[PDB]
RNA sequence: CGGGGGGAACCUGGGGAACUGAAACAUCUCAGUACCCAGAGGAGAGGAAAGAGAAAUCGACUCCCUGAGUAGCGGCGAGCG
RNA sequence: GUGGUUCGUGGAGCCAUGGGGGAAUCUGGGCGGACCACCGCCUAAGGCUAAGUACUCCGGGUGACCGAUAGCGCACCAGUA
RNA sequence: CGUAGGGAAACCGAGUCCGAACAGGGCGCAGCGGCCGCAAAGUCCGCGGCCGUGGACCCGAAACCGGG
RNA sequence: AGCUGGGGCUAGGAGUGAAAAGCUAACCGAGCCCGGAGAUAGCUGGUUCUCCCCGAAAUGACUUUAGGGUCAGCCUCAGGC
RNA sequence: GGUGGAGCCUGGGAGUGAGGGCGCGAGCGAUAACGUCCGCGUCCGAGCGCGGGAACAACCGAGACCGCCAGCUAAGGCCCC
RNA sequence: GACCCGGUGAAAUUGAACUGGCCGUGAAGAUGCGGCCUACCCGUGGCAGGACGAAAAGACCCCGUGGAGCUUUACUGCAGC
RNA sequence: GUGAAAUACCACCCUGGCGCGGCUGGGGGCCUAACCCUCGGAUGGGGGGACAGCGCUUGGCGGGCAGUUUGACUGGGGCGGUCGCCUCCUAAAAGGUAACGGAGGCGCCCAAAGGUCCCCUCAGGCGGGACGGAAAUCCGCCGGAGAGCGCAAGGGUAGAAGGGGGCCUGACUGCGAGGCCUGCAAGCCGAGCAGGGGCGAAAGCCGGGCCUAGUGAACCGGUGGUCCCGUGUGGAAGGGCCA
């Protein structure tokens, strides 16, 4: 990673719990990530949103 | 004078009932974002220490 | 009427290092030990709860055993306790 | 601002106090580990106090302690030459 | 000290911890002859080797510090 | 700016110094004595009777580590298979 | 197949972690070094005990429990020492 | 002075000595191993070539996570302002 | 009449601004008696003057002194160079194997350059064609791979790991038999079970990337979550577990 190849987390938009940790390239993806992952808390897949790490 | 229990160990490790040394798994304190889920998952568990090193870490625990 | 000075260590108060250990070293340790000073005595200090701390309990202080290298303290290092 | 306590600022109370501000007398005040409340313990800012405890210049008893390069530095005119 | 362990802990307990799990895995769980005797976990004192703490196998520094 | 007797004062991180780090009781880049003290020494040395069986290593990894150490390797002893 | 101071397992005690010559395979070196750095092996180390090599730790021979004024052999040797 | 006689009589040094030379060898500079040459036993005055002669646990050099003095815009503290 | 709010009048509050009083903070000026210096005389005179000096405290300058640090490898030390990870060789046809031996790279990157389904096959040589070229793109024959795979090198690879596109987020959670490697600790591969999903008609594949580097153990602390402990009790301070 670098200053452009940042770090970030995913937040189960339903219960707002952060679940996964990944990265992106804020120049090639300056839009906040929105990915559909699985929440062990809700116990069902859910759209997760890039929050800041 | 009697021996002093080494606390650097009693805070990290734990002697079982059969005479083994079980310490938590090293690696997942930080720098974990790009690590696997398998790598974070497996490292959250104890591991029996090598016999030679455990033997030493028990002579430091003379009273447990 | 009393004090002054002496006494081998032992005692309490006022001050108080370092080598060393941490396999370097500064916090830390060695340790409030060694040493200096004032004082006291056959002993000195402490001592009759504005305490301890969870028993709805104990009952001044001193010393030994035990509690225990437990609780905790610690560049949670060496180690302290 | 420090010292003591296992407590090295730690969530840091308790005991002590060099600096500042500065009360009350039982309807008082300190305490039970920051703080608030409930519940409890105690009753500071005057003092005294035997024994059980520590040491061994001194005297005595006794040793699977030494026996003149040993045992105190000195078994003898030694803290001497 | 031992008779119960597992867990950071509440806490459960021949099981317990991660877990949604009746899944999977970690650390755990069970004497010999003819009642007897014999053996043993464990524990206690001796002895022995080794380790920790202290000058710790003996002698040796250059140096630091304190009071005179 | 001389030499000199006698009486004096200044000292240990301190004194003096027409300056050499010279001098401070015959060795001064921090005097001497005594104490902390048996400082520390991963370095060198030294380690005392006899016989009996086995019998090495000087490699690898990490090591402010390289002439020192932790684990493994190679030796040994007791028990078990 | 192999019953060997063979091997597996648990446990206690170590020492070693400065190797060196030779032979073969390489690198480095100059197709130098009693040079250096690795690999398989061997020997000295620990066999500086014995025979040969004039003499010589490691080349050839050969693994020394002790005693004999007995015999056979290995390397190497048989004109004299 | 040295040297001879009477009188007194030290010293560092010293594994033990029955202590030759040459060509070789050997931890690479042999009185001590091998071969050869030489050499009768003990002395006194002398000369300094060798016993890698004596003395001082190399001032040089590196090593030690040794020390100490000096230095600064090295780190961290203290006096002082 | 009128606007959202409406008028005489009587309070409580604001806007701002003015004077008295409060109580303080700065600045100016002057006293004096604390405090300090001085005066043959001292319960006093004289000058300084609430500053200075001193005490607790803040922050700075501070080799003046004090305690220490100032790495190792090295064909002696120093100067130079190097220090972990990856690829090839040396490496003597298993693995492993040194040297300040010979050659080069990593400290990133991709939201697609991931997953799945379907389809497609390259460089290169010869001839062919406006602008138009030794190589822009089209047509034809030959072309088992010499192209390509983001980057060093290697091995691998079209019967895909290469190129196009569709729907997608498995770049999952909870574990994980058995193993490679191995001194420790680490690092590596991983079938399968459940939870919930994605691509597919289906068999099936998917726990990021054709692979091998792209990294950093504990200690200390930050943020979200959990709701386990809470120092007499209920909470809180502060912690532990998860990420
Ligand atoms: Mg992840
Ligand atoms: Mg436990
Ligand atoms: Mg961890
Ligand atoms: Mg964490
Ligand atoms: Mg990765
Ligand atoms: Mg994963
Ligand atoms: Mg988990
Ligand atoms: Mg206990
Ligand atoms: Mg127990
Ligand atoms: Mg007296
Ligand atoms: Mg005191
Ligand atoms: Mg002092
Ligand atoms: Mg010190
Ligand atoms: Mg010491
Ligand atoms: Mg130590
Ligand atoms: Mg000590
Ligand atoms: Mg030290
Ligand atoms: Mg040390
Ligand atoms: Mg030092
Ligand atoms: Mg102390
Ligand atoms: Mg005292
Ligand atoms: Mg006196
Ligand atoms: Mg007295
Ligand atoms: Mg008495
Ligand atoms: Mg009294
Ligand atoms: Mg009273
Ligand atoms: Mg106890
Ligand atoms: Mg106990
Ligand atoms: Mg720690
Ligand atoms: Mg202490
Ligand atoms: Mg303190
Ligand atoms: Mg703090
Ligand atoms: Mg404190
Ligand atoms: Mg307390
Ligand atoms: Mg006060
Ligand atoms: Mg009351
Ligand atoms: Mg009150
Ligand atoms: Mg109080
Ligand atoms: Mg209070
Ligand atoms: Mg309170
Ligand atoms: Mg209390
Ligand atoms: Mg409380
Ligand atoms: Mg009350
Ligand atoms: Mg109380
Ligand atoms: Mg009172
Ligand atoms: Mg009293
Ligand atoms: Mg008395
Ligand atoms: Mg008494
Ligand atoms: Mg007596
Ligand atoms: Mg006798
Ligand atoms: Mg006797
Ligand atoms: Mg005598
Ligand atoms: Mg005597
Ligand atoms: Mg006699
Ligand atoms: Mg289980
Ligand atoms: Mg099991
Ligand atoms: Mg029995
Ligand atoms: Mg016993
Ligand atoms: Mg041992
Ligand atoms: Mg000691
Ligand atoms: Mg000793
Ligand atoms: Mg000595
Ligand atoms: Mg000494
Ligand atoms: Mg010093
Ligand atoms: Mg000094
Ligand atoms: Mg004079
Ligand atoms: Mg004079
Ligand atoms: Mg005089
Ligand atoms: Mg003086
Ligand atoms: Mg001095
Ligand atoms: Mg002194
Ligand atoms: Mg002094
Ligand atoms: Mg001076
Ligand atoms: Mg003197
Ligand atoms: Mg002198
Ligand atoms: Mg000095
Ligand atoms: Mg002198
Ligand atoms: Mg003294
Ligand atoms: Mg000491
Ligand atoms: Mg030292
Ligand atoms: Mg003898
Ligand atoms: Mg080695
Ligand atoms: Mg290691
Ligand atoms: Mg290091
Ligand atoms: Mg070296
Ligand atoms: Mg070992
Ligand atoms: Mg056996
Ligand atoms: Mg056998
Ligand atoms: Mg054997
Ligand atoms: Mg063997
Ligand atoms: Mg063994
Ligand atoms: Mg070594
Ligand atoms: Mg060597
Ligand atoms: Mg050695
Ligand atoms: Mg070596
Ligand atoms: Mg070698
Ligand atoms: Mg060699
Ligand atoms: Mg030779
Ligand atoms: Mg050779
Ligand atoms: Mg041949
Ligand atoms: Mg050859
Ligand atoms: Mg060769
Ligand atoms: Mg080579
Ligand atoms: Mg050669
Ligand atoms: Mg060499
Ligand atoms: Mg070597
Ligand atoms: Mg040797
Ligand atoms: Mg031989
Ligand atoms: Mg042999
Ligand atoms: Mg031989
Ligand atoms: Mg011999
Ligand atoms: Mg010999
Ligand atoms: Mg021979
Ligand atoms: Mg011979
Ligand atoms: Mg011969
Ligand atoms: Mg044989
Ligand atoms: Mg014959
Ligand atoms: Mg012949
Ligand atoms: Mg002859
Ligand atoms: Mg004559
Ligand atoms: Mg004469
Ligand atoms: Mg000799
Ligand atoms: Mg002769
Ligand atoms: Mg030669
Ligand atoms: Mg010669
Ligand atoms: Mg000869
Ligand atoms: Mg001769
Ligand atoms: Mg001879
Ligand atoms: Mg000869
Ligand atoms: Mg002569
Ligand atoms: Mg000469
Ligand atoms: Mg001569
Ligand atoms: Mg002469
Ligand atoms: Mg000579
Ligand atoms: Mg000679
Ligand atoms: Mg000479
Ligand atoms: Mg000399
Ligand atoms: Mg010398
Ligand atoms: Mg020497
Ligand atoms: Mg020496
Ligand atoms: Mg020397
Ligand atoms: Mg030297
Ligand atoms: Mg040095
Ligand atoms: Mg160093
Ligand atoms: Mg070193
Ligand atoms: Mg220095
Ligand atoms: Mg001053
Ligand atoms: Mg000034
Ligand atoms: Mg004025
Ligand atoms: Mg003022
Ligand atoms: Mg004053
Ligand atoms: Mg200050
Ligand atoms: Mg200076
Ligand atoms: Mg400075
Ligand atoms: Mg100084
Ligand atoms: Mg300094
Ligand atoms: Mg020091
Ligand atoms: Mg070096
Ligand atoms: Mg290295
Ligand atoms: Mg060099
Ligand atoms: Mg050289
Ligand atoms: Mg060399
Ligand atoms: Mg080399
Ligand atoms: Mg350099
Ligand atoms: Mg290979
Ligand atoms: Mg090979
Ligand atoms: Mg292998
Ligand atoms: Mg290099
Ligand atoms: Mg790729
Ligand atoms: Mg054209
Ligand atoms: Mg290719
Ligand atoms: Mg590239
Ligand atoms: Mg190929
Ligand atoms: Mg594709
Ligand atoms: Mg696609
Ligand atoms: Mg869909
Ligand atoms: Mg496994
Ligand atoms: Mg492993
Ligand atoms: Mg990794
Ligand atoms: Mg499924
Ligand atoms: Mg499915
Ligand atoms: Mg479908
Ligand atoms: Mg899978
Ligand atoms: Mg990759
Ligand atoms: Mg792909
Ligand atoms: Mg790294
Ligand atoms: Mg640390
Ligand atoms: Mg839970
Ligand atoms: Mg509470
Ligand atoms: Mg709770
Ligand atoms: Mg309430
Ligand atoms: Mg609340
Ligand atoms: Mg909280
Ligand atoms: Mg929390
Ligand atoms: Mg975590
Ligand atoms: Zn959720």
Ramachandran sector of residue B7 (left: φ over 0; alpha: ψ -120 to 50; beta: rest): alpha
Match 């996964």 to its residue by tokens: A20
Q: Does the beta-carbon distance from B34 to A53 stay under 8 Å?
A: no
Residues 6+ apart with CB under 8 A from B59: none
Q: How far apart are CA B30 and CA A27, in angstroms?
A: 26
| Number of A–B residue contacts, CB under 8 Å | 8
Q: How far apart are CA A48 and CA A19, in angstroms?
A: 8
Experimental method: X-ray
Q: According to DSSP H, which parts of chain B are helical?
A: 7-10, 37-42, 51-59
Distance, first Cα to last Cα, chain B: 18
Q: Quick check: B32 contacting A, CB < 8 Å?
A: yes
Q: Does the beta-carbon distance from B32 to A21 stay under 8 Å?
A: yes
Distance A44 CA to ligand 181 centre (A): 14
Nucleic strand I near CB of residue B8 (< 7 Å): no
Question: Which chain G positions come under 7 Å from a protein C-beta?
Answer: 11-12
Q: How far apart are CA B9 and CA B21, in angstroms?
A: 10
Question: Which chain C positions come under 7 Å from a protein C-beta?
Answer: 68-70, 72-74, 76-81
């Amino acid at each position: 990673a670098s200053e452009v190849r940042i770090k970030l987390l995913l937040e189960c938009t339903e219960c707002k719990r952060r679940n996964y940790a990944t990265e992106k390239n804020k120049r090639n993806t300056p839009n906040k990530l929105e990915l559909r992952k699985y929440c062990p808390w809700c116990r069902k897949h859910t759209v997760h949103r890039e929050v800041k790490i | 004078p009697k021996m002093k229990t080494h606390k650097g160990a009693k805070k990290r490790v734990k002697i079982t009932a059969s005479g083994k040394v079980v310490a938590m798994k090293t690696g997942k304190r930080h720098l974990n974002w790009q690590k696997s889920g398998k790598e974070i998952r497996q490292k959250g568990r104890k591991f029996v220490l090598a016999k030679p090193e455990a033997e030493r870490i028990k002579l430091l625990l003379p009273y447990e």
